[PDB]
Amino acid sequence: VAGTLRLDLAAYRELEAFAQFGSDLDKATQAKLARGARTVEVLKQDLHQPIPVEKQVLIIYALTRGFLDDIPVEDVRRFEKEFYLFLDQNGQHLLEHIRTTKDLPNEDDLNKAIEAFKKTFVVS
Amino acid sequence: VAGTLRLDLAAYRELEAFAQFGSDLDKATQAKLARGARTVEVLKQDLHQPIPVEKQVLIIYALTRGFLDDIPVEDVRRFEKEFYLFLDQNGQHLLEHIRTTKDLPNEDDLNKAIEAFKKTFVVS
Amino acid sequence: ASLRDIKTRINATKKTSQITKAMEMVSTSKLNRAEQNAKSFVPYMEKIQEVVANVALGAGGASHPMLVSRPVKKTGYLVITSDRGLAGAYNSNVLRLVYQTIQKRHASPDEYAIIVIGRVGLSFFRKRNMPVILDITRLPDQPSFADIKEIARKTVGLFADGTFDELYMYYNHYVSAIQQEVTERKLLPLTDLAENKQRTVYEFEPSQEEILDVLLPQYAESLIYGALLDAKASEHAARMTAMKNATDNANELIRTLTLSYNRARQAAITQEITEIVAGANAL
Amino acid sequence: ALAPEIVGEEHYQVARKVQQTLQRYKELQDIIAILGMDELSDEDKLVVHRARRIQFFLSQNFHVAEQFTGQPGSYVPVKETVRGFKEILEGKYDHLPEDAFRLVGRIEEVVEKAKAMGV
Amino acid sequence: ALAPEIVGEEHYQVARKVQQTLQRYKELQDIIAILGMDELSDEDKLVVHRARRIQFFLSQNFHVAEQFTGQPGSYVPVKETVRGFKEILEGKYDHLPEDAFRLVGRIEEVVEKAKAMGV
């Protein structure tokens, strides 16, 4: 899941400098900026708040698959917090699978769970 | 000849940095940039190809007197090479006069020889 | 800071100053070109004004001067801006004035309309979603009549069809090389034709209701160019002033950075020699 | 001592917002230094608008400083400080001149001296 | 060893031309930053278009880099890379995206990756 994030940030490195004075008409660059801002806001964390790797993998997967591409940056911070509770409530079997075998579970079940959460999250 | 060459190169260098879009400022600036580029092309030299002082005098005279002002900057090196390969065949009197008297030859003869070479030099 | 950091800052500021000086020279040339182009066509405007003043009498059957097409309706707004920035407050002043006047002159987005010249105004009204009808962006920096005759004809047609009761235009007016003034000019309905001296019907008039009807699209083109001949000059003057200021600021920054660099260089030499001598006499 | 469990959540968020705006203004200062405020975006101009007023409102008149200038000093409670900075951050005072924020106590004195010098 | 008599005349010429193109690309970045690409000429736009592709094509995938990337490495012959750079300077691949040249190897891999991405 984390191979794409290096380049997702790396593009943002230059796009932030260019966007301050560029024309900003390319929708591809706009999507790059939208992904970069969201991943930057996701990487934030509060003091003395540990997160298990089984949930880190899933939040990174949700971010990198594009499921967060519609959630606003003002809301992704609370989106992750609610997603942890929802995952503990329903998707616990996926967490057990990741804890037992280090590989990701089957994509379709994970996508279904993420969609089921997105259809319950409230957007401000 | 160095008195004119130095002034031309200094004039080009004092405004070279503006050349990309400082063009079309005036006819005076256009000629200065055009002759400065050709001067820079003339001052190029190969790794182990020294040339006699008489040939240097001829080429600097041709540049300064404006005989290069209608040759594109992409062919100045070929112009120099062919000019030497023409001088050693025809301008023997000019070369010998320079080597013997340390002075320039007759300006009319110099102009005649330069035009004779120029009418046979292929543009590109 | 480090010597390398200060030297890199100095080099970057010097190259920026070079760019800005070249741009200022280009703008200074363009300003004179536009001033000549604007001053050239004064006699044509005078002639058309004189003809209109002679002919605008009797019934005045043309709809444009006589009456407002609707007592209350959408009001057309024509704005003239640049295609690219670095011109200072040239675009910002006009856009601010237009926005402030329309926010309290109109209450609904179907109570007005906007026609815009320039990419920056288009971007402004796209970001601040507002009703815009048509626009033109790509334009030579020495405009002529044929370049915008089609958009002038189209906006005249929109006014004549009854889409706008009134029509104003907003642009920058050139007062001096330093001062640019935003000007509100009411275009239609035609009201302020003061009387003149020249003989009426200088040649036999086939019909007032036909001569005025044919002539009024042309008079409005004499009023639209009178705008693009002044806005262009104001834009070039504003660019020249902005680049002059930027070059001066860059020069001052270079001077201060050079002072700091000299202090750092002296401090580094002193520290190195002091450490050398301490190590040498520590034995 | 600047922790959410020590000073309060609203105090912590106000302080963090003020620091964020000041950092953004510090970043922009380099560009405004050369080419002025005209080439900034609509967001950055608002950032500068808020940041200058916040920076001026951080000033205060001291009781000790009465010898240096005739104005007497002011003691500002922390709740008043937090409320005033929150109100400034919310944009309640963008129409007041920035000179009205210099060397005052509570946020009310800014309004009072803005009214004294104009509206 | 970069001399015509040692490395070959065409190799020396293409290498020096690539070097000149990259150096000219370095000369345009300040102008691009301050003005945008709109102020460039049609030829200089082409120069930047080709220079970015050349710079990305200078990258390669290493066999020992599998531990950091996953993808296997490749070995590129000198004649193959000379021909590929000559073709890129000729413009046979201007239509392909710049990122199609990242960490690829041969032009036969550039075209394959461009086809794979579905452009």
TrEMBL record, chains A, B:
<comment type="similarity">
    <text>Belongs to the ATPase alpha/beta chains family.</text>
</comment>
<feature type="binding site">
    <location>
        <position position="45"/>
    </location>
    <ligand>
        <name>ATP 1</name>
    </ligand>
</feature>
<feature type="domain" description="ATP synthase alpha subunit C-terminal">
    <location>
        <begin position="1"/>
        <end position="117"/>
    </location>
</feature>
<feature type="binding site">
    <location>
        <position position="46"/>
    </location>
    <ligand>
        <name>ATP 1</name>
    </ligand>
</feature>
<comment type="function">
    <text>Produces ATP from ADP in the presence of a proton gradient across the membrane. The alpha chain is a regulatory subunit.</text>
</comment>
<feature type="binding site">
    <location>
        <position position="45"/>
    </location>
    <ligand>
        <name>ATP 2</name>
    </ligand>
</feature>
<protein>
    <recommendedName>
        <fullName>ATP synthase subunit alpha</fullName>
    </recommendedName>
</protein>
From TrEMBL, chain C:
<keyword id="KW-0375">Hydrogen ion transport</keyword>
<protein>
    <recommendedName>
        <fullName>ATP synthase gamma chain</fullName>
    </recommendedName>
</protein>
<comment type="similarity">
    <text>Belongs to the ATPase gamma chain family.</text>
</comment>
<dbReference type="GO" id="GO:0042777">
    <property type="term" value="P:proton motive force-driven plasma membrane ATP synthesis"/>
</dbReference>
<comment type="function">
    <text>Produces ATP from ADP in the presence of a proton gradient across the membrane. The gamma chain is believed to be important in regulating ATPase activity and the flow of protons through the CF(0) complex.</text>
</comment>
<dbReference type="InterPro" id="IPR035968">
    <property type="entry name" value="ATP_synth_F1_ATPase_gsu"/>
</dbReference>
<dbReference type="GO" id="GO:0045259">
    <property type="term" value="C:proton-transporting ATP synthase complex"/>
</dbReference>
<dbReference type="GO" id="GO:0005886">
    <property type="term" value="C:plasma membrane"/>
</dbReference>
<keyword id="KW-0139">CF(1)</keyword>
<keyword id="KW-0066">ATP synthesis</keyword>
<dbReference type="InterPro" id="IPR023632">
    <property type="entry name" value="ATP_synth_F1_gsu_CS"/>
</dbReference>
<dbReference type="Pfam" id="PF00231">
    <property type="entry name" value="ATP-synt"/>
</dbReference>
<keyword id="KW-0472">Membrane</keyword>
<dbReference type="GO" id="GO:0046933">
    <property type="term" value="F:proton-transporting ATP synthase activity, rotational mechanism"/>
</dbReference>
<dbReference type="GO" id="GO:0005524">
    <property type="term" value="F:ATP binding"/>
</dbReference>
Automatic annotation (TrEMBL), chains D, E:
<comment type="function">
    <text>Produces ATP from ADP in the presence of a proton gradient across the membrane. The catalytic sites are hosted primarily by the beta subunits.</text>
</comment>
<protein>
    <recommendedName>
        <fullName>ATP synthase subunit beta</fullName>
    </recommendedName>
</protein>
<comment type="function">
    <text>Produces ATP from ADP in the presence of a sodium ion gradient across the membrane. The beta chain is the catalytic subunit.</text>
</comment>
<comment type="similarity">
    <text>Belongs to the ATPase alpha/beta chains family.</text>
</comment>
